[PDB]
Structure 1
Amino acid sequence: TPVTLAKVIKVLGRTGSRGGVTQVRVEFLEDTSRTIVRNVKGPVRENDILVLMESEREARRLR
């Protein structure tokens, strides 16, 4: 399974109607110097580690 780890490098801002989803640009660990902006669900502070499921997909807006 393509398990991919990502590290939080900064926080960006809040998007979504539920008010718990946070736009976060992360830097993935293995083979670095590329980054993806993603959307967390629970409480995340900086330099947390998350597990990416898909490799290349980003979301930008939640109504």
Structure 2
Amino acid sequence: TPVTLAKVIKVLGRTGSRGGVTQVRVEFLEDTSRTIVRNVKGPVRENDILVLMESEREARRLR
């Protein structure tokens, strides 16, 4: 069953209606040079490692 570990390289900014969600740009550990934009719920800094439960998706913003 697939999960992908992903290292954050640049935090972009806060999204969502309340402001509790952050756009980040993550790099995959295996298959690097693939870049995507995802949503994070909690406190995040850079060089953190996410577990994307599926990698074929990109959010931009939350309206």
**What's the TM-score once normalised by structure 1's chain length?**
0.92
Distance 1:55 1:2 in 2: 9
User: Normalized per residue, which structure has more strand?
Assistant: 2
Unaligned runs of 5+ in 1: none
% same residue = 100
Unaligned runs of 5+ in 2: none
> Which contiguous aligned blocks of 4+ residues in structure 1 show a shift greater than 3 angstroms?
none
Distance 1:55 1:13 in 2: 20
RMSD of equivalent CA atoms = 0.9
Distance 2:44 2:14 in 1: 12
The number of equivalent residue pairs is 63
Deviation (angstroms), 1:55:
2.1
